[PDB]
Design a binder for this molecule. Structure first.
Ligand SMILES: [Cl-]
Ligand SMILES: [Cl-]
Ligand SMILES: [Cl-]
Ligand SMILES: [Cl-]
Ligand SMILES: [Cl-]
Ligand SMILES: [Cl-]
Ligand SMILES: [Cl-]
Ligand code: NA
Length: 129
């Protein structure tokens, strides 16, 4: 599914991401735009052989099982295919674990490079929330 900006903001608000560990909703919407262009089916292969999955590009080295990342962990206890669903529940529940891991949203390279320190409230402007 390719979400609209406000559609995704509403879905993330309903799943408890607004101010989760102090990160306002616009941070999560901005991260999704630049990681995946709001497409749940996005995949990208890394040099190390791991793959990033779904709207928040969650990596198979640590967070999900894809059956082809040798010596990896599955800390979210999910098949990586679950992260590509039109239902963002699995992605949101795993993202809450990642952002609690000590580096906050710096875990998402596109957030650090494109969202951090910008006016992220712009990402939820005009939305009915
Ligand atoms: Cl947009
Ligand atoms: Cl915000
Ligand atoms: Cl594996
Ligand atoms: Cl594991
Ligand atoms: Cl699994
Ligand atoms: Cl959803
Ligand atoms: Cl933090
Ligand atoms: Na894994």
């Amino acid at each position: 599914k390719v979400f609209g900006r406000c559609e995704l903001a509403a879905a993330m608000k309903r799943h408890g991401l607004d101010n989760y560990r102090g990160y306002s909703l616009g941070n999560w919407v901005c991260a999704a735009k630049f990681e995946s262009n709001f497409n749940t089916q996005a995949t990208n292969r890394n040099t190390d052989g791991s793959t990033d999955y779904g709207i928040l590009q969650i990596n198979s080295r640590w967070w999900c099982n894809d059956g082809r990342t040798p010596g990896s962990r599955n800390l979210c206890n999910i098949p990586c295919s679950a992260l590509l669903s039109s239902d963002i529940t699995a992605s949101v529940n795993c993202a809450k674990k990642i952002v609690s891991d000590g580096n906050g949203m710096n875990a998402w390279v596109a957030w650090r490079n494109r969202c951090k320190g910008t006016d992220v409230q712009a990402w939820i402007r005009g939305c009915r929330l």
